[PDB]
Amino acid sequence: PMEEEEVETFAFQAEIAQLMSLIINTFYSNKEIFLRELISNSSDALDKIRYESLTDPSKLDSGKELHINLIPNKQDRTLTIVDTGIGMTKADLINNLGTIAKSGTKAFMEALQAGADISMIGQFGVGFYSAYLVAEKVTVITKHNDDEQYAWESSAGGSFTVRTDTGEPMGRGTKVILHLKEDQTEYLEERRIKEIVKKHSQFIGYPITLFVE
Ligand SMILES: Cc1cc(-c2ccc([N+](=O)[O-])cc2Cl)nc(N)n1
Numbered sequence: 145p146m147e148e149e150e151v152e153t154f155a156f157q158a159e160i161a162q163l164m165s166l167i168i169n170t171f172y173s174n175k176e177i178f179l180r181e182l183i184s185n186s187s188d189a190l191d192k193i194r195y196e197s198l199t200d201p202s203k204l205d206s207g208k209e210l211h212i213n214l215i216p217n218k219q220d221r222t223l224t225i226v227d228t229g230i231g232m233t234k235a236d237l238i239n240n241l242g243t244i245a246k247s248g249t250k251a252f253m254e255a256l257q258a259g260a261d262i263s264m265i266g267q268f269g270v271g272f273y274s275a276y277l278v279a280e281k282v283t284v285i286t287k288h289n290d291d292e293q294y295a296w297e298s299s300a301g302g303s304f305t306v307r308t309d310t311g312e313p314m315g316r317g318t319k320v321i322l323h324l325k326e327d328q329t330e331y332l333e334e335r336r337i338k339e340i341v342k343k344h345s346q347f348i349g350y351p352i353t354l355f356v357e
Pocket residue numbers: 185186189227229230231232240241242246269270271272273284318320
């Protein structure tokens with residue numbers, strides 16, 4: 145082959161699988177809130193590396209710039225959210241993206257069913273799964289200091305994969321790649337992305353840059 149590598153398959157924790165199944169099927173009107181949830185996670189990841197750099201400036205040797213990039217790609221039908229935050233070790237990725245029950249999961253589930261604003265429920269990492277409101281597949285690329293670059297992927301269905309990433313090296317941070325549903329291509333439009341950022345993520349303390357082609 146052109147390339148080959150080992151790929152690990154993990155089953156989602158029962159409550160996480162239930163949450164994903166609910167997000168994928170529910171009629172939820174305010175789907176645009178997925179972007180707020182991912183930008184909030186990136187903001188928290190940027191706060192963490194920034195905090196660690198106060199007592200150890202060498203933590204930013206992998207990149208001083210603390211920011212968020214939004215990258216729509218009409219050809220691949222993908223929307224990517226990139227940050228230069230703390231990133232995730234392999235253990236961090238397996239633990240935080242599927243194998244462990246998370247705080248805010250029940251609140252998220254109940255808010256979805258009630259048609260409530262899942263944003264006003266809290267600042268929970270689990271808000272990540274709102275990506276499946278607009279995407280059929282999510283790929284997460286991540287790089288933590290003193291560790292290798294890893295790739296997580298899931299099209300839901302009860303399982304996810306983890307492998308060493310062979311793509312373009314990141315200095316540090318996390319890339320969330322949304323493979324958008326055919327009927328959700330408005331989130332590739334520059335005008336729409338600007339509107340959603342201004343409406344729900346206007347007061348983020350890091351620059352947000354849109355890559356337009
Ligand atoms: C370090 C880190 C972690 C996370 C994250 C945090 C929590 C989840 N989650 O599914 O709970 C998913 C992700 Cl991908 N997101 C970013 N942007 N950066």
